Amino acid sequence: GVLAAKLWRKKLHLTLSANLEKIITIGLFFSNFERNPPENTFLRLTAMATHSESNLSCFAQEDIAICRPHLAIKMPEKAEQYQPLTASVSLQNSLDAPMEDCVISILGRGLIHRERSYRFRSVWPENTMCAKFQFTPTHVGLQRLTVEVDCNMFQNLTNYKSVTVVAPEL
Amino acid sequence: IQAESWDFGQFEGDVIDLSLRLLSKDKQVEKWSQPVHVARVLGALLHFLKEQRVLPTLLNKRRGSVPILRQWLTGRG
Amino acid sequence: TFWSLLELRRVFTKGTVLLDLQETSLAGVANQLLDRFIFEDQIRPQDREE
């Protein structure tokens, strides 16, 4: 609840006819913001209507989350222990700028020892990343692969997928 | 609602030793048979450690609870 | 021998280390070691199976 930064303000002057409902549509655009929101913050959108000298203002507020591109992980539901397993990871660049300084990390207890970070190419807007990773699961059970993507537009974008690693056939 | 994958890592090799070392700051060892007393003591101590060690504002990169516990208890990390 | 320590230092300088590996079988140790070998460009992916 701590106030981070003031991003956008907008003043309208309207005339409402008596006993008439009016709907005003306002576009909330990122490029209108006076500055980029700090990381891990949320958007407080407030409306305030004041008329003449009624000494009372209508007010409403809404908390808006900032939505980052979906990190899609494709991996078989079941995997054999001590056999190589391929997981493809895709991200669509839905921003207004290229994605630069791109680092992707993969980890998960029971599949990968500590973490392995890789660099993939810069992604131009409306293009897609499609990275494939090969690793051998070594522990039997219900495991989880965690993928983290870093760039100059966003950081610590994390998605996960669960894989059941089964014992080899006797 | 955004779900963030988290590695609790309670079965890491040093987490049990670190938890018992933290509990050892409580001198009512006779009460360690009681989960209520143990939970209260550890919650108070971990809140104290969080207030001592968490700094005012990568910096937001997280690898689960175990590195945070190690840094809170030892100052390294 | 002199050449023994010579080449041991030479391969240690670019060696692949897996420290505190949570493994309990030779197959798992070998698989993780070969994965880290590929990661550090020590071996090509076509050599991993052999």
Binding site: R119, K132 | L58, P67, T74, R76 | -
Partner: peptide
Amino acid sequence: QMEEPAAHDTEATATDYHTTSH
């Protein structure tokens, strides 16, 4: 997939796996 991602030697989270056990 299509990408052949190149390894990135990073030690930003290296200390996150340093155990406290002597």
